[PDB]
Structure formats: structure tokens, C-alpha cells
Amino acid sequence: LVPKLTASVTDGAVGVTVDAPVSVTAADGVLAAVTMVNENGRPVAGRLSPDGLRWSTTEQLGYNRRYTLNATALGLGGAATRQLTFQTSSPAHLTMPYVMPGDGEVVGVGEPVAIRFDENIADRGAAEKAIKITTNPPVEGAFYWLNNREVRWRPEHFWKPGTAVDVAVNTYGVDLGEGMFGEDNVQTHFTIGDEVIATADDNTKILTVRVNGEVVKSMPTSMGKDSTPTANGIYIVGSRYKHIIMDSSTYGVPVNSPNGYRTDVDWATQISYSGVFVHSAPWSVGAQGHTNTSHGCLNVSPSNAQWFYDHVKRGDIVEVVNTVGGTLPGIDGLGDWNIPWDQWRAGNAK
Numbered sequence: 001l002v003p004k005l006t007a008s009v010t011d012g013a014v015g016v017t018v019d020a021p022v023s024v025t026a027a028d029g030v031l032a033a034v035t036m037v038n039e040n041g042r043p044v045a046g047r048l049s050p051d052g053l054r055w056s057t058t059e060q061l062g063y064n065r066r067y068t069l070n071a072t073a074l075g076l077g078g079a080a081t082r083q084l085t086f087q088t089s090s091p092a093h094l095t096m097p098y099v100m101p102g103d104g105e106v107v108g109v110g111e112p113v114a115i116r117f118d119e120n121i122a123d124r125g126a127a128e129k130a131i132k133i134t135t136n137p138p139v140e141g142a143f144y145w146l147n148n149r150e151v152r153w154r155p156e157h158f159w160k161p162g163t164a165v166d167v168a169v170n171t172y173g174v175d176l177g178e179g180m181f182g183e184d185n186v187q188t189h190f191t192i193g194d195e196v197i198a199t200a201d202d203n204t205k206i207l208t209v210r211v212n213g214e215v216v217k218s219m220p221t222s223m224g225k226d227s228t229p230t231a232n233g234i235y236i237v238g239s240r241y242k243h244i245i246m247d248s249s250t251y252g253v254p255v256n257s258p259n260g261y262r263t264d265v266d267w268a269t270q271i272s273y274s275g276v277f278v279h280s281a282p283w284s285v286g287a288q289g290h291t292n293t294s295h296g297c298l299n300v301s302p303s304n305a306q307w308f309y310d311h312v313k314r315g316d317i318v319e320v321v322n323t324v325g326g327t328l329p330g331i332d333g334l335g336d337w338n339i340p341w342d343q344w345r346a347g348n349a350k
Contacts, residue, residue: 001028001075001076001077002028002029002075002077002078002079002080003026003027003028003029003030003073003074003075003077003078003079003080004026004027004028004029004073004080005024005025005026005071005073005080005081005082006024006025006026006027007022007023007024007025007069007071007082007084008020008021008022008023008024009022009069009084009086010084010086011082011083011084011085011086012085012086013086013087014086014087015087015088015089015090016086016087016088016089017088017089017173017174017175018060018061018062018063018088018089018172018173019130019170019172019173019174020173021056021057021058021061022036022056022057022061022067022069023054023055023056023057024054024055024056024069024071025053025054025055026052026053026054026073026075028075028077029073029074029075029076029077029079029080030051030052030053030073030074030075031048031052031053031054031055031071031072031073032072032073032074032079033070033071033072034046034048034055034069034070034071034072035069035070035071036057036067036068036069036070037067037068038062038065038066038067038068039065039066044057044059044061044067045057045058045059046058046059055071060172061088061173062088063088063089063090063091063181064088064089064090064091065087065088066085066086066087066088067085067086067087067088068083068084068085069082069083069084069085069086070082070083089173089175089181091179091180091181092178092179092180093119093178093179093180093181094119094180094181094182094183095117095118095119095121095171095176095180095181095182095183096117096118096182096183096184097115097116097117097169097171097182097184097186098115098116098117098118098186099113099114099115099116099167099169099186099187099188100113100114100116100188101114101188101190101314101315102188102190103187103188103189103190104189104190105190105191105314106190106191106192106193106313107190107191107192107193107313107314107315108192108193108194108195108196108236108237108312108313108314108315108316108317109158109159109160109161109192109193109195109196109197109315109316109317110158110159110234110236110237110315110316110317110337111159111190111192111236111314111315112152112153112154112236112336113133113141113152113153113154113165113167114150114151114152114153115127115131115150115151115152115153115167115169116149116150117149117150117176118149119149119180120148120149121148121149121151121176121177121180122176122177122178122180123175123176123177123178124145124151124348124349124350125349125350126174126175126176126177127151127171127174127176128143128151128347128349129174130169130170130171130174130182131143131151131153131167131168131169131170131171132166132167132168132170133153133165133166133167133168134164134165134166134167134168135163135164135165135166136163136164136165137160137163139155139159139160139163140155140156141153141154141155141156142154142344142345142347143347143349144336144339144344144347144348145347145348145349146331146332146333146336147331152336154336154337154344156341156344156345158195158317158337159192160192161192161193161194161195161212162191162192163191163192164189164191165189165190165191165192166187166188166189167187167188167189167190168185168187169185169186169187170182170185171183171184171185172184172185192315193313193315194211194212195210195211195212195213196209196210196211196311196312196313196316196317197209197210197316197317197318197319198210198308198312198316198317198318198319199318199319199321200221200223200230200298200318200319200320200321201321201322202223202230202292202320202321202322202323202324203321203322205220205221205222205223205288205289205290205291205292206218206219206220206221206289207219207220207221207278207298207300207304207318209308209311209312211311216311217304217307217308217311219300219301219304219307219308220288220289220290220300220301220304221288221289221298221299221300222281222284222287222288222289222290222291222292222293222294222298222299223292223294223296223297223298223299223320223323224292224294224295224296224297224323224325225292225293225294225295226292226324227259228259228294228295228296229292229296229323229324229325230276230292230294230296230297230298230320230323230325231272231274231276231296231320231323231325231326231327231328231329232320232321232322232323232325232326232327232328233319233320233327233328233335233337233338234317234318234319234328234335234337234338235271235272235276235317235318235319235320235328235334235335236271236315236316236317236318236334236335236336236337237269237270237271237312237313237314237315237316237317237318237334238269238270238271238272238273238314238333238334239269239270239314240268240269240270240309240312240313240314241267241268241269241270241309242266242267242309243264243265243266243267243268244264244265244268244279245262245263245264245265246261246262246263246264246265246268246275246277246279246297247261247262248260248261248262248275248295250275251273251274251275259295261295265277265279265280265281266279266280266302266305266306267279267280267302267305267306267308267309268280268305268309269305269308269309269312270334271298271318271334272328272332272333272334272335273332273333273334274296274328274329274332274333275296275297276296276297276298277297277298278297278298278300278305278308278312278318279297279298279299279300279305280300280301280302280304280305280306281294281297281299281300281301281305282301282302284299285301287299288300288301292323298318317337
């Protein structure tokens with residue numbers, strides 16, 4: 001019996017995806033040498049196994065390349081040699097993923113996994129498949145798309161604190177549809193911090209912060225006036241500013257219109273892309289606890305706003321109840337938890 005050479009590609013193959021290493025195997029013999037070069041002749045790095053039976057590329061393979069594999073096998077039954085040439089994927093387009101939250105970070109119990117792509121994803125299912133979420137302790141979750149470029153992942157309920165989350169975005173080599181392929185892989189790992197949930201009740205006009213179930217702060221607040229009310233629902237804490245200029249046009253309301261505004265404020269914590277912040281409002285302290293007067297934000301006293309900035313982190317939860325507003329859109333950017341689990345779990349990959 002002569003040595004037999006088997007590869008994970010075949011001679012003449014086209015559209016070989018490069019999301020996987022290329023391998024050669026010997027049977028009834030051992031591999032004497034294996035090489036793989038591109039058209040230019042540039043070698044691809046490989047590795048033979050100690051027992052001489054298996055060889056595998058150890059380097060990333062390129063898009064739009066023709067590769068040539070040469071292998072020799074020897075055995076008691078004589079020798080064997082194959083030459084294979086194959087052609088890899090040639091994308092029409094490349095898309096790059098950006099993953100949040102940031103790596104190593106510790107975040108609140110409402111933080112979703114987010115993958116944003118710089119281009120429109122025609123085959124959402126393929127993108128979902130290439131994204132591998134690991135959770136410790138394990139918990140079940142699901143993918144949902146807020147728009148054509150960004151997919152989110154989260155459990156049915158708020159994370160239990162102390163949970164490790166690993167996000168492996170392995171889109172390199174993956175067809176995301178209409179000839180779009182991943183430009184790269186990205187990998188983030190984060191931990192879930194303390195449970196922090198702040199409830200804003202319009203009936204009482206108090207924002208109450210609860211850390212691991214204990215009340216630790218009680219803030220009189222002035223929310224949005226009836227003409228421009230604060231939406232009820234769940235808000236996820238986003239970014240935090242010592243000071244910031246709030247510009248109504250950044251959220252699609254012309255500064256120059258009636259509900260327009262441009263305000264320089266202190267100690268602001270964004271809780272929706274739609275432009276809701278908890279921020280310091282000295283100008284309404286007499287209204288806080290009593291009357292709604294804002295364009296939508298949660299007005300608090302300077303010292304309470306700064307307290308919020310210092311003790312609330314990305315991913316903590318703010319819940320608004322009993323306002324005259326509607327509900328905060330689930331596809332807001334920070335309003336993911338307002339979408340019913342059955343609807344979220346069903347996803348929208350198609």
C-alpha cells in the first residue's frame with residue numbers, strides 16, 4: 001500500500017473561504033515535505049505534526065489569491081506526491097466589525113453585546129453565525145438587529161452580576177452576502193459589575209437609585225413637560241460627561257424650532273440616543289420634585305447629577321414610569337430591553 005494524501009481543499013477549487021486553515025494528511029506513510037506558496041511565490045507558513053501525519057497552515061490566508069500546495073509522502077509501500085492549486089474568495093466588498101462594550105471593562109447588568117458593521121449586511125444569518133458568545137455562568141441569549149448595520153445580543157433578563165462574557169467576532173473569510181466579506185476578526189471580553197437600577201417615577205417625581213437592591217440615593221427630578229414628555233420604559237446607561245453641549249439638532253430637532261435647544265450642561269449621563277440625559281439643572285431646582293419642565297432629560301440638582309456620574313457606570317439601568325409619554329423605542333440604541341423577549345428571541349435575521 002502506497003501513501004495516500006488527503007487535503008482539506010481540492011485541486012481546481014475556487015471560492016475557497018479563508019476562515020479556516022488548510023490542511024494535508026497522510027495515510028499509510030508520513031509527510032516528508034509540504035509547501036504552499038501564492039502566485040508571487042511567497043511562502044505560506046505551515047506546521048507539521050510530530051508524528052509526521054498532519055500539516056496545517058498556521059498563518060491567515062489572503063482574499064483573491066491562487067495558492068499552490070506541494071506535498072510528499074513516504075511509506076513502506078513507496079512514495080507519493082500531489083500538487084494542488086486552489087483559488088480563494090474574491091470579495092466585491094469588505095466590511096469591518098466594531099464590538100462593544102470595550103475589552104476588559106466592567107459594566108452594568110443591562111449592557112448588551114453589540115456588533116456594528118461599517119457596511120449594510122445583506123445576510124444577517126451569516127453574520128449571527130460567525131459571532132460566538134461565551135458566558136460564565138452560562139445563560140441563554142439571542143441576536144436582534146437595530147438597523148442594517150448593528151446586531152445586539154442579550155439574555156432574557158438583566159445579567160446576574162459576576163458574569164464573564166466573551167465575544168468572538170469571526171467574520172474574516174465569511175460571506176455576509178452580496179459578495180461582502182469580513183475584513184477582520186475582533187474579540188472583546190467583559191465582566192458584569194454590580195446591579196444598579198435607578199427608577200424615575202413621574203407620580204412622585206423622584207429618581208431612586210438602587211444598588212444590589214438597596215436604596216442609596218433619592219433624587220428629586222424634573223422630567224419632560226407635557227408637550228415634550230420623557231418616554232416611559234427601560235433605558236440603558238451609555239456614556240458619561242463632566243460637561244457637554246446638548247444640541248437638539250443632533251437628535252433631529254432644529255435648534256431654531258420651538259422644541260429646539262442648545263444647552264451647555266454639567267454632569268450628564270446619556271440614557272438614550274434620542275437625547276435623554278440625567279444632568280445637572282440648577283435652573284429648575286425649585287421645580288424638581290414637583291413639576292416637569294425639561295425637553296425630555298431627567299433634571300437633577302448639581303450634587304445629585306455628579307453623584308450619578310460617579311456611581312453609575314455604562315450598562316446600569318434607568319427605568320421611567322408613569323409619564324404622559326409613550327414608550328422608549330426598542331431600536332433606540334439604548335432601549336433594547338423595551339422589546340418583548342419573544343419578539344427579541346425570534347430575531348430578525350430575515
